């Protein structure tokens, strides 16, 4: 259960798991996450900017 | 159980707005007789009769036929599409020459309607939603057709064949494919919904006019 | 002349022909709804607005039932709450699990009314219905698996925009909303179906995936593209 | 007092079974079209009072006072046309009486249309006949042509100075369009989805005009009541359940048939007499559905002493409905039969409103799992709850009628459901 | 990221009354622009109008 | 005689029997009421 450095995961096929839903950004207490998204070339709902300020995050 | 028939239209060479359809002059006379059964300003009330007449003329309902009905009745083509897709007696796909519709609801299911369906399937060598390779027979399941006391029964082009057995339905299919038209009605020797053992009612001649008439009336 | 009706026992004078929903609105109670729009005609099909009259054994559709003299409307009664829970249960039983990938997101009437009037658990142990998506132009994106068949877009299209190319094809649980043909719903008033759709079935295509409702700041200004001054 | 053993001199629907001529000559050989002009001259109030005294109730499902309904439509004109809509969309599974009346007594139907239209002050009567009954509709049109040629209907009908038209409208296949407001919507060239009340059809009906929707059997028995008394009709039956009735006995019975009897004949006597009893005898009986698919079922215990009557079947947690008596013997899959009924309701659902649409699909799936035991006993009460959530929360009564068979099955054969689930669990756990 | 130099960018205050808000603005010395509350006008609804005999309110679909 | 089925006239009907009967009935009809407009869209 240890909470250390952050990571963005992928599906076993190589596709990114994140769907730009901004639930983490909404729930972040310290507002450490900045998210910007748009439809991809193939129409996927994927992020273009996913920033985490690790000096603002409270882990 | 999914019906297996979609409710969206994709243009095909055999079904597109450029498909040739138009009513015959006789059918135009029939349409003009139909339309004036409804009050002026309510010509949209004739959508079902006119669409049924178009299907009777053409054998089925293409998108061109739907558009023609809409144009004739000055009603939106989307409303015509709504009616056509809602009502199950409208064939939006080509069907066989004889459209066997086996009623499979519980009153017909209690008697061996599954036997009738299996006999039809073996006789024609088709499934319960397919059409014979010679475009002669189409087989479908339907709900109650109003002849429950005469179960099991089928409907083949607005003709009821009732009190059926596998041999009876096989004979009916043989007669249809030969060319002859079988006589609709019960196949068990009954004429109508009367009990098979004998008449338990209406055994005496009917009483004539003015039998139990009120004093003043 | 005005007739006296009661909402939760509170008297209110309403004009004849006023509905239960409008009486509750007068006393300040907003009855839940999915198909009712005050700018459109009354449909009464989503059945979400069912309320209890004090002596009536049967619930009434508040959006379509005119009030009678001396009617007591029990908006927060057990029967009304159970009716709302059942209707929401059916809606979410056939609804898809698309909330994170859905642009309606945090401004969805299905989510909010489920959190306020529905249950917190599901009893649906079967499979869900998936519906093919239509294409009605480059402005409105259609994901019709999320449609709740409320016929807001159809009524708006016809009555307001004078365009009669929207409707329901088929019947039963397989009833679908669309054109039945590859036709683009092109009109000068096409985005209002995006606005009035309570679910993410109709969403803005240029705005797709870009933002979420809680992030946005609202600036109340006027329109300059024409001389109406919207 | 006992009821039954109706006499042929008192049976209203002669020419049933089609053993006599159904034409105008054959109908006039019987009592049809006799002093109809005198009845019309007596006028609306006399006809309405005669119907009210006869105490006739709706013969196409929910039994309401037809006198009260026609009095509802007896309001003064307000500059709009007036219509009687005759329901002949016999979509209820188990029912053939309307088919028999149309095919064998079309002149009785037409005379009843004329009498009811005069009572309601109606200019026209639209007989909405289901599209499967093509031959019945053609016979009806032939009889209507005969009536028009003889001058019995049309302008100066029966030489009485009353103008009345009789049109026949053939629908397509929609058991929901069988419903009265859906019938009205289908006449107007629409999908056929039931309306919300108010407005009631007696105030805003087809084309927006005042219309009264009445069953074929009701309108057909109207002129016989008019020519006869209505003290007589009230004499036949119980106090608040008067007259004769057409019963369609079908299913696991020796002689499936349609017969006419009194309105309070016991079910056991009716089955044993007019239908030859159950196939394996009365001891082989398992369940009976007395009013078509909408009404719940009753076990042999209830069927042992029950009266084929509105109130009598209401006291038995059931309903009379269309008096379609479906018989199921001990050697039947009752769960499969009820599941097939629910599948019928799923297919014959207009899909307008959420409770019936989604919940009926859900109940169809749950019953389909039930018939094979692929479920748990905790889902029986959940199914009951969802059926109760469908009932009473729908626009029309199809949602209510889709829950009553489920409720009856759960109420009377819960042990069978639990035993089948246990058997399935044993079968799958052995793997 | 999006930068700012305005302290009062995120400051929104809630008041129960236009008079209360105006009083607060006046005592705090900021300029203020007041917008009158817009409430929807009452509308007459009828389900029976969807099936009018002679009026255009009759609907072509349900 | 009550032993013969007299409803045998319906083993002759064709596709347009109902509509031809409707056409024949046209002459016997009476003028239809008018809503005052050609269509609800007018
Ligand atoms: C042939 C027929 C079919 C009917 N089907 C339905 C139906 O599917 N659903 C429903 O709620 N009512 C149904 N009804 C009942 C009607 O809504 C309505 O109560 C009836 O037609 C009125 O006739 P009555 O006054 O003679 O009873 C049906 C009635 C008839 C006669
Ligand atoms: S936006 Fe955040 S919560 Fe949503 S999918 Fe991406 S990482 Fe997960
Ligand atoms: S429409 Fe609403 S409930 Fe449905 S997926 Fe989108 S946010 Fe969720
Ligand atoms: S697409 Fe939206 S507005 Fe249209 S019927 Fe469906 S839920 Fe309602
Ligand atoms: S209960 Fe079912 S059949 Fe009746 S209006 Fe609702 S969706 Fe249609
Ligand atoms: S159940 Fe088959 S005809 Fe009615
Ligand atoms: S808001 Fe009333 S039923 Fe939809
Ligand atoms: Mg939307």
mmCIF file of C-alpha atoms in Angstrom, chain D residues 128-420:
data_model
loop_
_atom_site.group_PDB
_atom_site.id
_atom_site.type_symbol
_atom_site.label_atom_id
_atom_site.label_comp_id
_atom_site.label_asym_id
_atom_site.label_seq_id
_atom_site.Cartn_x
_atom_site.Cartn_y
_atom_site.Cartn_z
ATOM 1 C CA UNK D 128 -60.614 -0.639 -35.817
ATOM 2 C CA UNK D 129 -59.980 -4.277 -36.767
ATOM 3 C CA UNK D 130 -56.608 -5.974 -36.393
ATOM 4 C CA UNK D 131 -54.714 -6.574 -39.620
ATOM 5 C CA UNK D 132 -54.425 -10.331 -39.171
ATOM 6 C CA UNK D 133 -58.225 -10.694 -39.442
ATOM 7 C CA UNK D 134 -58.291 -9.910 -43.154
ATOM 8 C CA UNK D 135 -61.145 -12.294 -43.971
ATOM 9 C CA UNK D 136 -63.114 -11.081 -40.945
ATOM 10 C CA UNK D 137 -62.625 -7.475 -42.071
ATOM 11 C CA UNK D 138 -63.732 -8.375 -45.603
ATOM 12 C CA UNK D 139 -66.897 -10.049 -44.292
ATOM 13 C CA UNK D 140 -67.537 -6.981 -42.135
ATOM 14 C CA UNK D 141 -67.159 -4.715 -45.175
ATOM 15 C CA UNK D 142 -69.537 -6.925 -47.174
ATOM 16 C CA UNK D 143 -72.139 -6.686 -44.407
ATOM 17 C CA UNK D 144 -71.639 -2.915 -44.224
ATOM 18 C CA UNK D 145 -72.183 -2.664 -47.982
ATOM 19 C CA UNK D 146 -75.373 -4.704 -47.617
ATOM 20 C CA UNK D 147 -76.563 -2.377 -44.847
ATOM 21 C CA UNK D 148 -75.799 0.708 -46.946
ATOM 22 C CA UNK D 149 -77.624 -0.743 -49.958
ATOM 23 C CA UNK D 150 -80.645 -1.622 -47.816
ATOM 24 C CA UNK D 151 -80.522 1.857 -46.277
ATOM 25 C CA UNK D 152 -80.053 0.577 -42.726
ATOM 26 C CA UNK D 153 -77.022 2.854 -42.253
ATOM 27 C CA UNK D 154 -75.981 6.093 -43.919
ATOM 28 C CA UNK D 155 -78.111 9.170 -44.398
ATOM 29 C CA UNK D 156 -81.621 8.822 -42.960
ATOM 30 C CA UNK D 157 -80.570 5.570 -41.323
ATOM 31 C CA UNK D 158 -83.452 3.082 -41.044
ATOM 32 C CA UNK D 159 -85.716 5.908 -42.214
ATOM 33 C CA UNK D 160 -85.239 7.783 -38.939
ATOM 34 C CA UNK D 161 -83.597 11.020 -40.082
ATOM 35 C CA UNK D 162 -80.320 10.207 -38.305
ATOM 36 C CA UNK D 163 -77.093 10.361 -40.317
ATOM 37 C CA UNK D 164 -74.528 7.785 -39.203
ATOM 38 C CA UNK D 165 -71.484 6.372 -40.995
ATOM 39 C CA UNK D 166 -69.655 3.094 -40.341
ATOM 40 C CA UNK D 167 -66.032 2.863 -41.505
ATOM 41 C CA UNK D 168 -63.652 -0.074 -41.084
ATOM 42 C CA UNK D 169 -59.989 0.685 -40.368
ATOM 43 C CA UNK D 170 -57.495 -2.174 -40.630
ATOM 44 C CA UNK D 171 -54.530 -1.810 -38.307
ATOM 45 C CA UNK D 172 -51.201 -3.572 -38.370
ATOM 46 C CA UNK D 173 -49.929 -5.959 -35.731
ATOM 47 C CA UNK D 174 -49.784 -4.161 -32.385
ATOM 48 C CA UNK D 175 -51.285 -5.633 -29.225
ATOM 49 C CA UNK D 176 -50.558 -2.237 -27.676
ATOM 50 C CA UNK D 177 -52.550 -0.573 -30.461
ATOM 51 C CA UNK D 178 -55.314 -2.773 -29.108
ATOM 52 C CA UNK D 179 -55.464 -0.282 -26.223
ATOM 53 C CA UNK D 180 -58.077 2.447 -26.566
ATOM 54 C CA UNK D 181 -55.859 5.542 -26.591
ATOM 55 C CA UNK D 182 -53.279 3.675 -28.658
ATOM 56 C CA UNK D 183 -56.172 2.665 -30.929
ATOM 57 C CA UNK D 184 -57.030 6.356 -31.316
ATOM 58 C CA UNK D 185 -53.398 7.258 -32.022
ATOM 59 C CA UNK D 186 -53.167 4.482 -34.622
ATOM 60 C CA UNK D 187 -56.315 5.712 -36.381
ATOM 61 C CA UNK D 188 -54.642 9.118 -36.761
ATOM 62 C CA UNK D 189 -51.753 7.557 -38.690
ATOM 63 C CA UNK D 190 -49.298 7.570 -35.785
ATOM 64 C CA UNK D 191 -47.146 5.004 -33.997
ATOM 65 C CA UNK D 192 -49.879 3.880 -31.623
ATOM 66 C CA UNK D 193 -48.621 4.832 -28.164
ATOM 67 C CA UNK D 194 -51.262 5.336 -25.455
ATOM 68 C CA UNK D 195 -52.097 8.847 -24.309
ATOM 69 C CA UNK D 196 -52.244 10.229 -20.777
ATOM 70 C CA UNK D 197 -55.559 10.925 -19.066
ATOM 71 C CA UNK D 198 -56.789 13.671 -18.864
ATOM 72 C CA UNK D 199 -57.926 14.454 -21.525
ATOM 73 C CA UNK D 200 -60.302 11.505 -21.499
ATOM 74 C CA UNK D 201 -61.441 10.075 -24.857
ATOM 75 C CA UNK D 202 -65.034 11.132 -24.160
ATOM 76 C CA UNK D 203 -63.762 14.738 -24.317
ATOM 77 C CA UNK D 204 -60.726 14.582 -26.639
ATOM 78 C CA UNK D 205 -60.522 11.453 -28.777
ATOM 79 C CA UNK D 206 -59.590 10.653 -32.366
ATOM 80 C CA UNK D 207 -58.876 13.760 -34.466
ATOM 81 C CA UNK D 208 -59.418 15.666 -31.206
ATOM 82 C CA UNK D 209 -63.179 15.036 -31.344
ATOM 83 C CA UNK D 210 -65.336 13.379 -28.666
ATOM 84 C CA UNK D 211 -65.053 9.621 -29.140
ATOM 85 C CA UNK D 212 -66.158 6.609 -27.121
ATOM 86 C CA UNK D 213 -64.151 3.391 -27.440
ATOM 87 C CA UNK D 214 -66.252 0.261 -26.944
ATOM 88 C CA UNK D 215 -65.668 -3.447 -27.455
ATOM 89 C CA UNK D 216 -67.141 -5.451 -30.327
ATOM 90 C CA UNK D 217 -69.055 -7.695 -27.926
ATOM 91 C CA UNK D 218 -70.440 -4.696 -26.026
ATOM 92 C CA UNK D 219 -71.699 -2.880 -29.108
ATOM 93 C CA UNK D 220 -73.024 -6.136 -30.595
ATOM 94 C CA UNK D 221 -75.073 -6.933 -27.479
ATOM 95 C CA UNK D 222 -76.365 -3.353 -27.251
ATOM 96 C CA UNK D 223 -79.196 -3.647 -29.846
ATOM 97 C CA UNK D 224 -80.402 -6.980 -28.462
ATOM 98 C CA UNK D 225 -80.684 -5.293 -25.061
ATOM 99 C CA UNK D 226 -82.560 -2.413 -26.696
ATOM 100 C CA UNK D 227 -85.075 -4.618 -28.539
ATOM 101 C CA UNK D 228 -85.462 -6.772 -25.427
ATOM 102 C CA UNK D 229 -85.658 -5.238 -21.974
ATOM 103 C CA UNK D 230 -82.664 -5.053 -19.671
ATOM 104 C CA UNK D 231 -84.558 -6.329 -16.726
ATOM 105 C CA UNK D 232 -84.034 -9.584 -18.639
ATOM 106 C CA UNK D 233 -80.316 -8.885 -19.126
ATOM 107 C CA UNK D 234 -80.007 -7.935 -15.450
ATOM 108 C CA UNK D 235 -81.864 -11.144 -14.564
ATOM 109 C CA UNK D 236 -79.098 -13.087 -16.292
ATOM 110 C CA UNK D 237 -76.158 -12.974 -13.872
ATOM 111 C CA UNK D 238 -75.424 -11.750 -10.363
ATOM 112 C CA UNK D 239 -76.563 -8.419 -8.911
ATOM 113 C CA UNK D 240 -73.706 -6.244 -10.212
ATOM 114 C CA UNK D 241 -72.539 -8.758 -12.860
ATOM 115 C CA UNK D 242 -75.400 -9.072 -15.329
ATOM 116 C CA UNK D 243 -75.858 -10.575 -18.767
ATOM 117 C CA UNK D 244 -74.317 -13.284 -20.893
ATOM 118 C CA UNK D 245 -70.657 -13.709 -21.767
ATOM 119 C CA UNK D 246 -68.513 -15.328 -24.452
ATOM 120 C CA UNK D 247 -65.916 -17.678 -22.953
ATOM 121 C CA UNK D 248 -62.961 -18.966 -24.988
ATOM 122 C CA UNK D 249 -61.855 -22.204 -23.321
ATOM 123 C CA UNK D 250 -58.463 -23.249 -24.683
ATOM 124 C CA UNK D 251 -55.223 -24.929 -23.697
ATOM 125 C CA UNK D 252 -54.933 -28.374 -22.095
ATOM 126 C CA UNK D 253 -58.624 -29.156 -22.500
ATOM 127 C CA UNK D 254 -60.388 -31.916 -24.413
ATOM 128 C CA UNK D 255 -62.667 -29.633 -26.471
ATOM 129 C CA UNK D 256 -61.236 -26.133 -26.930
ATOM 130 C CA UNK D 257 -64.059 -23.883 -28.057
ATOM 131 C CA UNK D 258 -65.828 -20.538 -27.813
ATOM 132 C CA UNK D 259 -69.225 -20.662 -26.101
ATOM 133 C CA UNK D 260 -71.821 -18.330 -24.600
ATOM 134 C CA UNK D 261 -72.896 -18.709 -20.981
ATOM 135 C CA UNK D 262 -74.182 -16.748 -18.014
ATOM 136 C CA UNK D 263 -71.972 -14.190 -16.289
ATOM 137 C CA UNK D 264 -71.603 -16.178 -13.043
ATOM 138 C CA UNK D 265 -71.245 -19.777 -14.239
ATOM 139 C CA UNK D 266 -68.684 -21.678 -12.124
ATOM 140 C CA UNK D 267 -65.417 -22.357 -13.923
ATOM 141 C CA UNK D 268 -65.455 -26.088 -13.149
ATOM 142 C CA UNK D 269 -68.950 -26.547 -14.588
ATOM 143 C CA UNK D 270 -68.092 -24.520 -17.696
ATOM 144 C CA UNK D 271 -64.936 -26.536 -18.387
ATOM 145 C CA UNK D 272 -66.595 -29.892 -17.699
ATOM 146 C CA UNK D 273 -69.692 -29.127 -19.787
ATOM 147 C CA UNK D 274 -68.730 -27.027 -22.807
ATOM 148 C CA UNK D 275 -65.090 -28.122 -23.119
ATOM 149 C CA UNK D 276 -65.012 -31.806 -22.148
ATOM 150 C CA UNK D 277 -62.936 -31.199 -19.028
ATOM 151 C CA UNK D 278 -59.190 -31.376 -18.628
ATOM 152 C CA UNK D 279 -57.398 -33.871 -20.859
ATOM 153 C CA UNK D 280 -56.395 -36.140 -17.981
ATOM 154 C CA UNK D 281 -59.527 -35.389 -15.990
ATOM 155 C CA UNK D 282 -60.159 -32.716 -13.394
ATOM 156 C CA UNK D 283 -57.627 -34.322 -11.040
ATOM 157 C CA UNK D 284 -54.989 -33.615 -13.715
ATOM 158 C CA UNK D 285 -55.556 -29.848 -13.475
ATOM 159 C CA UNK D 286 -52.651 -27.610 -12.455
ATOM 160 C CA UNK D 287 -53.641 -23.994 -13.136
ATOM 161 C CA UNK D 288 -56.119 -21.845 -15.047
ATOM 162 C CA UNK D 289 -55.778 -18.313 -16.426
ATOM 163 C CA UNK D 290 -59.376 -17.004 -16.563
ATOM 164 C CA UNK D 291 -58.961 -13.695 -18.399
ATOM 165 C CA UNK D 292 -56.080 -13.954 -20.838
ATOM 166 C CA UNK D 293 -52.420 -13.216 -20.268
ATOM 167 C CA UNK D 294 -53.021 -10.007 -18.303
ATOM 168 C CA UNK D 295 -54.926 -11.717 -15.497
ATOM 169 C CA UNK D 296 -52.913 -13.843 -13.037
ATOM 170 C CA UNK D 297 -53.349 -17.604 -12.693
ATOM 171 C CA UNK D 298 -55.168 -19.618 -10.045
ATOM 172 C CA UNK D 299 -54.326 -23.135 -8.798
ATOM 173 C CA UNK D 300 -56.697 -26.092 -8.761
ATOM 174 C CA UNK D 301 -57.751 -25.174 -5.213
ATOM 175 C CA UNK D 302 -59.267 -21.877 -6.361
ATOM 176 C CA UNK D 303 -60.649 -23.387 -9.580
ATOM 177 C CA UNK D 304 -62.503 -26.042 -7.567
ATOM 178 C CA UNK D 305 -65.082 -23.470 -6.385
ATOM 179 C CA UNK D 306 -64.894 -20.181 -8.295
ATOM 180 C CA UNK D 307 -67.357 -18.259 -10.457
ATOM 181 C CA UNK D 308 -66.410 -16.886 -13.881
ATOM 182 C CA UNK D 309 -67.366 -13.409 -12.732
ATOM 183 C CA UNK D 310 -65.793 -9.990 -12.227
ATOM 184 C CA UNK D 311 -66.167 -9.743 -8.445
ATOM 185 C CA UNK D 312 -65.779 -13.493 -7.903
ATOM 186 C CA UNK D 313 -62.432 -13.547 -9.713
ATOM 187 C CA UNK D 314 -61.353 -10.293 -8.041
ATOM 188 C CA UNK D 315 -61.842 -11.979 -4.663
ATOM 189 C CA UNK D 316 -59.568 -14.765 -5.967
ATOM 190 C CA UNK D 317 -56.657 -12.346 -6.578
ATOM 191 C CA UNK D 318 -57.421 -12.431 -10.315
ATOM 192 C CA UNK D 319 -59.670 -10.778 -12.887
ATOM 193 C CA UNK D 320 -62.294 -11.728 -15.431
ATOM 194 C CA UNK D 321 -60.691 -9.762 -18.263
ATOM 195 C CA UNK D 322 -61.788 -11.070 -21.654
ATOM 196 C CA UNK D 323 -63.017 -14.360 -20.115
ATOM 197 C CA UNK D 324 -60.328 -16.282 -22.008
ATOM 198 C CA UNK D 325 -59.937 -19.501 -20.006
ATOM 199 C CA UNK D 326 -56.501 -21.036 -20.632
ATOM 200 C CA UNK D 327 -56.170 -24.442 -18.950
ATOM 201 C CA UNK D 328 -52.837 -25.966 -17.895
ATOM 202 C CA UNK D 329 -52.721 -29.547 -16.631
ATOM 203 C CA UNK D 330 -50.227 -31.160 -14.252
ATOM 204 C CA UNK D 331 -47.903 -32.165 -17.115
ATOM 205 C CA UNK D 332 -46.847 -28.656 -18.108
ATOM 206 C CA UNK D 333 -43.944 -26.306 -17.402
ATOM 207 C CA UNK D 334 -45.761 -23.493 -15.617
ATOM 208 C CA UNK D 335 -42.584 -21.412 -15.314
ATOM 209 C CA UNK D 336 -41.979 -21.764 -19.055
ATOM 210 C CA UNK D 337 -45.585 -20.800 -19.831
ATOM 211 C CA UNK D 338 -45.409 -17.658 -17.695
ATOM 212 C CA UNK D 339 -42.006 -16.838 -19.193
ATOM 213 C CA UNK D 340 -43.507 -17.120 -22.676
ATOM 214 C CA UNK D 341 -46.285 -14.751 -21.605
ATOM 215 C CA UNK D 342 -43.682 -12.280 -20.330
ATOM 216 C CA UNK D 343 -41.761 -12.613 -23.601
ATOM 217 C CA UNK D 344 -45.005 -11.842 -25.436
ATOM 218 C CA UNK D 345 -45.375 -8.704 -23.328
ATOM 219 C CA UNK D 346 -41.755 -7.760 -24.056
ATOM 220 C CA UNK D 347 -42.344 -8.087 -27.802
ATOM 221 C CA UNK D 348 -45.762 -6.391 -27.596
ATOM 222 C CA UNK D 349 -44.489 -3.343 -25.703
ATOM 223 C CA UNK D 350 -44.814 0.071 -27.314
ATOM 224 C CA UNK D 351 -41.727 1.242 -25.421
ATOM 225 C CA UNK D 352 -42.960 4.780 -24.779
ATOM 226 C CA UNK D 353 -42.479 4.919 -21.020
ATOM 227 C CA UNK D 354 -39.592 3.830 -18.845
ATOM 228 C CA UNK D 355 -41.179 1.472 -16.252
ATOM 229 C CA UNK D 356 -42.842 -0.897 -18.705
ATOM 230 C CA UNK D 357 -40.090 -0.624 -21.313
ATOM 231 C CA UNK D 358 -37.017 -1.294 -19.189
ATOM 232 C CA UNK D 359 -38.693 -3.323 -16.444
ATOM 233 C CA UNK D 360 -40.513 -5.643 -18.839
ATOM 234 C CA UNK D 361 -37.264 -6.352 -20.674
ATOM 235 C CA UNK D 362 -35.626 -6.964 -17.277
ATOM 236 C CA UNK D 363 -38.435 -9.275 -16.135
ATOM 237 C CA UNK D 364 -38.209 -11.189 -19.413
ATOM 238 C CA UNK D 365 -34.508 -11.793 -18.776
ATOM 239 C CA UNK D 366 -35.119 -12.775 -15.140
ATOM 240 C CA UNK D 367 -37.884 -15.221 -16.094
ATOM 241 C CA UNK D 368 -35.696 -16.682 -18.848
ATOM 242 C CA UNK D 369 -33.072 -17.392 -16.200
ATOM 243 C CA UNK D 370 -35.784 -18.724 -13.862
ATOM 244 C CA UNK D 371 -37.084 -21.387 -16.255
ATOM 245 C CA UNK D 372 -33.674 -23.100 -16.214
ATOM 246 C CA UNK D 373 -32.916 -22.467 -12.534
ATOM 247 C CA UNK D 374 -29.939 -20.196 -13.292
ATOM 248 C CA UNK D 375 -30.863 -17.896 -10.414
ATOM 249 C CA UNK D 376 -31.017 -17.690 -6.618
ATOM 250 C CA UNK D 377 -33.995 -17.709 -4.226
ATOM 251 C CA UNK D 378 -33.180 -14.120 -3.235
ATOM 252 C CA UNK D 379 -34.171 -12.976 -6.743
ATOM 253 C CA UNK D 380 -37.829 -14.003 -6.352
ATOM 254 C CA UNK D 381 -38.600 -11.111 -4.006
ATOM 255 C CA UNK D 382 -36.534 -8.793 -6.214
ATOM 256 C CA UNK D 383 -38.635 -9.858 -9.208
ATOM 257 C CA UNK D 384 -41.784 -9.224 -7.175
ATOM 258 C CA UNK D 385 -40.515 -5.753 -6.265
ATOM 259 C CA UNK D 386 -39.647 -4.821 -9.847
ATOM 260 C CA UNK D 387 -43.038 -6.099 -11.042
ATOM 261 C CA UNK D 388 -44.683 -3.904 -8.407
ATOM 262 C CA UNK D 389 -42.528 -0.996 -9.598
ATOM 263 C CA UNK D 390 -43.854 -1.543 -13.123
ATOM 264 C CA UNK D 391 -47.477 -1.772 -11.978
ATOM 265 C CA UNK D 392 -49.200 1.555 -11.377
ATOM 266 C CA UNK D 393 -46.222 3.608 -12.594
ATOM 267 C CA UNK D 394 -46.919 3.278 -16.335
ATOM 268 C CA UNK D 395 -48.788 5.419 -18.848
ATOM 269 C CA UNK D 396 -51.164 2.601 -19.801
ATOM 270 C CA UNK D 397 -52.320 -0.715 -18.358
ATOM 271 C CA UNK D 398 -49.991 -2.940 -20.401
ATOM 272 C CA UNK D 399 -47.331 -2.449 -17.737
ATOM 273 C CA UNK D 400 -49.824 -3.489 -15.066
ATOM 274 C CA UNK D 401 -50.870 -6.498 -17.140
ATOM 275 C CA UNK D 402 -47.237 -7.510 -17.635
ATOM 276 C CA UNK D 403 -46.724 -7.795 -13.858
ATOM 277 C CA UNK D 404 -49.867 -9.667 -12.793
ATOM 278 C CA UNK D 405 -48.911 -13.049 -14.366
ATOM 279 C CA UNK D 406 -45.497 -12.774 -12.700
ATOM 280 C CA UNK D 407 -47.170 -11.991 -9.377
ATOM 281 C CA UNK D 408 -49.513 -14.953 -9.772
ATOM 282 C CA UNK D 409 -46.665 -17.331 -10.590
ATOM 283 C CA UNK D 410 -44.596 -16.085 -7.642
ATOM 284 C CA UNK D 411 -47.617 -16.280 -5.334
ATOM 285 C CA UNK D 412 -48.871 -19.758 -6.232
ATOM 286 C CA UNK D 413 -45.752 -21.607 -7.450
ATOM 287 C CA UNK D 414 -42.824 -20.189 -5.500
ATOM 288 C CA UNK D 415 -41.905 -23.729 -4.298
ATOM 289 C CA UNK D 416 -41.480 -24.790 -7.933
ATOM 290 C CA UNK D 417 -39.132 -21.863 -8.588
ATOM 291 C CA UNK D 418 -37.080 -22.648 -5.486
ATOM 292 C CA UNK D 419 -36.948 -26.364 -6.320
ATOM 293 C CA UNK D 420 -35.830 -25.679 -9.893
#
